[PDB]
From a paper:
We determined crystal structures of unbound, phosphate-bound, AMP-bound, and ATPγS-bound wild-type EfFIC (EfFICWT) and of unbound and sulfate-bound EfFIC carrying a mutation of the catalytic histidine into an alanine (EfFICH111A). All EfFIC monomers resemble closely to each other and to structures of other class III FIC proteins. Notably, the C-terminal α-helix that bears the inhibitory glutamate (E190) shows no tendency for structural flexibility, even in molecules where it is free of crystalline contacts. E190 has the same conformation as in other glutamate-bearing FIC protein structures and is stabilized by a salt bridge with Arg122 and, when present, by interactions with the nucleotide cofactor. EfFIC forms equivalent dimers in all crystal forms, but the arrangement of these dimers in higher-order assemblies varies between crystals. Depending on the crystal forms, EfFIC does not form assemblies larger than the dimers or forms tetramers related to the NmFIC tetramer or forms hexamers comprised of trimers of dimers, making it difficult to establish the functional oligomeric state based on the crystallographic assemblies.
Residue numbers in the entry: 8 to 207
Write the structure that this text describes.
Amino acid sequence: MLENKLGIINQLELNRVEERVSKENAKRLYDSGDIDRIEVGTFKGLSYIHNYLFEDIYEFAGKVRSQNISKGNFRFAPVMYLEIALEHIDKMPQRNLDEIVAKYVEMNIAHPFREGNGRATRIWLDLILKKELKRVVDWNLINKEDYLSAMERSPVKDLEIKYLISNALTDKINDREIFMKGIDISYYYEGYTEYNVDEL
């Protein structure tokens, strides 16, 4: 079981409350205009997003994990060099899709937080795409199974994820609906489907 701020004992109740509360926050991040104020393409901006979503639930929100994490078929950056690997990602270029995908693949391997990495880094990605290409991802054009397979392959070859991203881009960078739908899809990629962000 994981430590939380709401004194929850059940993992299934914790999943439900985390989903509702962080989704409420994600909706606020957008409607408040705070999303537009965040620094783009940096760990400082990523940390801002992660804290915005998870701060009422977890003590660690926005903070770099102090311990090693293992899940999936590739290793995440070991804590022995995670800090300097984040300094390296901050220095990576973001001029074109090749560079944006390569930067994103590295941030996914870093997986700097205890949890919520996927959800926060997808918001973070869309902002880089918004600033540099004047595009966002229509996450509705990316299937869960395709996405998950493409992400697992990415440490070896970023082609599959670059293809899914390239083909889902839209110039509708200020469309609230693309955003809100993307939150619900991002959460679904991680198994959280109890709520709809626009009903919150």
